Amino acid sequence: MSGNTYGKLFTVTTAGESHGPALVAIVDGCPPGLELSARDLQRDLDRRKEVEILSGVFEGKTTGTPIGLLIRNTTAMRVAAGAIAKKYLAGLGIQVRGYMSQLGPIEIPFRSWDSVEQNAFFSPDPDKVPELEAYMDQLRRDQDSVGAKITVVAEGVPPGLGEPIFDRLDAELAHALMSINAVKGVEIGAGFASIAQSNNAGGILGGISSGQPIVAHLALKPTRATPIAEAMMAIVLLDQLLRQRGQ
């Protein structure tokens, strides 16, 4: 339907049904000078386990003009847009990465970033992968599904990001992350855990970034969510970052 645009400065507008002729996006605020090509978008799309750049780049670098994306169709656009934001944010030394914290009753503890890209579950502990595989098989046998907890983390973000009262950084992240269909809950920092009363502000104080790492936890309802969560986090961070230069 008609809520097909997101962002203020760094803006994504999108169109297409998954069964129709194509998906199309226009990404609107990307600063000039970024080395960008269809394979940069391909790498992010594949992590989820065909993108044509129609405009907004000249000899392999971004001009400042709107970028048209086209996907031929023989979550796509959200991820492809986010790949542009990640690639830009990388240039400022900002890294947005996600992992699975929980698959149903199996709490998975964090052991390394590197381990995340080595398994199908985005599990940061490779010793839990056998258990996670066997649990999934059990679900596959019973035909029923179950929720998960995704954790998305942005490192190197400077302090100052966020625009109170209504467009607080935690609030804009909540919007973008909760827009994912599976996501029924969002936490910045410790959140609902330790209602009872590194860092548990989760990088955000009074809706402005600390300079600390920004940490969001996502709750996924019973029906590949990590890449689309990272994409949304990157889009919001880039959008807020560009609204900063303006001051």
Add this chain to the structure above:
Amino acid sequence: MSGNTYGKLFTVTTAGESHGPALVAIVDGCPPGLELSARDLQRDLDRRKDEVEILSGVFEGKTTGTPIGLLIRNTRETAMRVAAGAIAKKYLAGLGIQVRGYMSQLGPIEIPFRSWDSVEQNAFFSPDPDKVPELEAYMDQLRRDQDSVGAKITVVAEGVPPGLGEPIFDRLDAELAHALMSINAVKGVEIGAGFASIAQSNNAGGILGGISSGQPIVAHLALKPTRATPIAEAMMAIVLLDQLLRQRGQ
């Protein structure tokens, strides 16, 4: 600072520091015909625990459809959010939509739901009046130690029709998360069971694919340690009214 406006159709734009001469909001989009006055706004403000002047947008006690200017003299930052939300509640009530909140948890004290009526009978928004003595003595334990603790508020909207929500980016759960998470104390938002039932009437909160079911819409909010309930209700009401007006287009 500069993120001082919320909404597309039913919109709230604000200004003022809590220490300055005044607070001002302009509420844009309220349908005409609503019986509205300064006392309707006062009732919601006091539940936070005359003041608000309606500068425009009402003629002989009813809303004209033109923008409503609100002014709160500073003889606090949450005031305009609550006063704008009062207008939305009062409209939504007319369509048989009720937005109400309660405290589900004060620190380690889980407090179970017993009645709506009990909510407005105690200082904790506790829906169980049998927990109130415990909740009070917990309070003079914290007050002794000068330290504070968090809470969990539950906000519920009843009577909402199916069809509200605008995918992909302006899904109803998403627009609620934005508005609730904008409250300063709020560090977490769930629609339905959420985080509590990762290991798995209606747990879904009345929202399916980001569109309302017709079922009651239930949101839980995690408040960091540092009165939140009225402001959560106000925010929920504003988003529901905005989405409903936006729906009216076919």
